[PDB]
Symmetry: none
Subunit: 45 residues, 2 copies
Protein backbone atom coordinates (compact mmCIF):
# COMPACT_ATOMS: atom_id res chain seq x y z
CA UNK A 1 0.00 0.00 0.00
CA UNK A 2 1.17 3.52 -0.78
CA UNK A 3 0.09 6.13 1.74
CA UNK A 4 -0.40 9.70 0.51
CA UNK A 5 -1.17 12.67 2.71
CA UNK A 6 -0.49 16.39 2.87
CA UNK A 7 2.82 17.54 4.32
CA UNK A 8 2.39 18.99 7.80
CA UNK A 9 5.54 21.16 7.70
CA UNK A 10 5.59 22.45 4.12
CA UNK A 11 4.92 26.23 4.08
CA UNK A 12 2.44 27.82 1.68
CA UNK A 13 1.63 26.81 -1.88
CA UNK A 14 3.23 23.94 -3.75
CA UNK A 15 4.38 24.78 -7.27
CA UNK A 16 12.03 19.94 -4.54
CA UNK A 17 11.07 21.84 -1.34
CA UNK A 18 8.02 19.58 -1.02
CA UNK A 19 10.06 16.40 -1.43
CA UNK A 20 12.47 17.78 1.18
CA UNK A 21 9.69 18.52 3.66
CA UNK A 22 8.14 15.08 3.17
CA UNK A 23 11.42 13.20 3.66
CA UNK A 24 11.92 15.29 6.79
CA UNK A 25 8.50 14.01 7.92
CA UNK A 26 9.75 10.44 7.37
CA UNK A 27 7.99 9.90 4.03
CA UNK A 28 9.97 8.80 0.97
CA UNK A 29 8.91 11.44 -1.57
CA UNK A 30 6.74 14.51 -2.12
CA UNK A 31 4.96 16.18 -5.04
CA UNK A 32 2.62 19.11 -5.70
CA UNK A 33 -1.06 18.49 -6.40
CA UNK A 34 -2.39 19.91 -9.67
CA UNK A 35 -5.61 21.57 -8.49
CA UNK A 36 -5.19 22.50 -4.84
CA UNK A 37 -1.43 23.04 -5.16
CA UNK A 38 -0.53 21.34 -1.89
CA UNK A 39 2.57 19.40 -0.97
CA UNK A 40 1.61 15.72 -0.82
CA UNK A 41 3.89 13.14 0.78
CA UNK A 42 4.07 9.48 -0.22
CA UNK A 43 5.56 6.39 1.42
CA UNK A 44 5.06 2.63 1.59
CA UNK A 45 2.73 1.65 4.43
Amino acid sequence: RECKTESNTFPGICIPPCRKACISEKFTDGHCSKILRRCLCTKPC
Copy 2:
Protein backbone atom coordinates in the same frame (compact mmCIF):
# COMPACT_ATOMS: atom_id res chain seq x y z
CA UNK B 1 -7.33 11.74 -3.36
CA UNK B 2 -5.14 11.49 -0.31
CA UNK B 3 -5.39 8.10 1.34
CA UNK B 4 -3.59 7.00 4.45
CA UNK B 5 -4.06 5.02 7.63
CA UNK B 6 -6.04 6.71 10.38
CA UNK B 7 -3.69 7.79 13.15
CA UNK B 8 -6.28 7.87 15.96
CA UNK B 9 -8.62 4.98 15.13
CA UNK B 10 -8.19 2.31 17.82
CA UNK B 11 -7.80 -1.34 16.90
CA UNK B 12 -9.13 -3.43 14.05
CA UNK B 13 -11.45 -1.99 11.43
CA UNK B 14 -14.56 -4.18 11.70
CA UNK B 15 -17.19 -1.81 10.35
CA UNK B 16 -16.84 1.48 8.50
CA UNK B 17 -18.78 4.06 10.52
CA UNK B 18 -16.37 4.31 13.48
CA UNK B 19 -13.48 4.51 11.02
CA UNK B 20 -15.26 7.22 9.02
CA UNK B 21 -15.80 9.08 12.30
CA UNK B 22 -12.13 8.89 13.29
CA UNK B 23 -11.01 9.96 9.82
CA UNK B 24 -13.37 12.95 9.85
CA UNK B 25 -11.97 13.96 13.24
CA UNK B 26 -8.54 13.87 11.60
CA UNK B 27 -9.95 16.26 8.98
CA UNK B 28 -10.45 13.78 6.15
CA UNK B 29 -13.86 13.38 4.49
CA UNK B 30 -14.35 9.61 4.66
CA UNK B 31 -12.88 6.38 5.93
CA UNK B 32 -13.12 2.69 5.10
CA UNK B 33 -11.75 -0.64 6.27
CA UNK B 34 -8.96 -2.23 4.25
CA UNK B 35 -9.93 -5.65 2.82
CA UNK B 36 -7.45 -7.91 4.65
CA UNK B 37 -5.35 -6.17 7.32
CA UNK B 38 -8.57 -4.40 8.16
CA UNK B 39 -6.90 -1.12 8.94
CA UNK B 40 -8.91 2.08 8.98
CA UNK B 41 -8.02 4.13 5.90
CA UNK B 42 -8.88 7.83 5.59
CA UNK B 43 -9.57 9.68 2.33
CA UNK B 44 -10.03 13.27 1.24
CA UNK B 45 -9.58 15.59 -1.65
CA UNK B 46 -5.81 16.82 -1.89
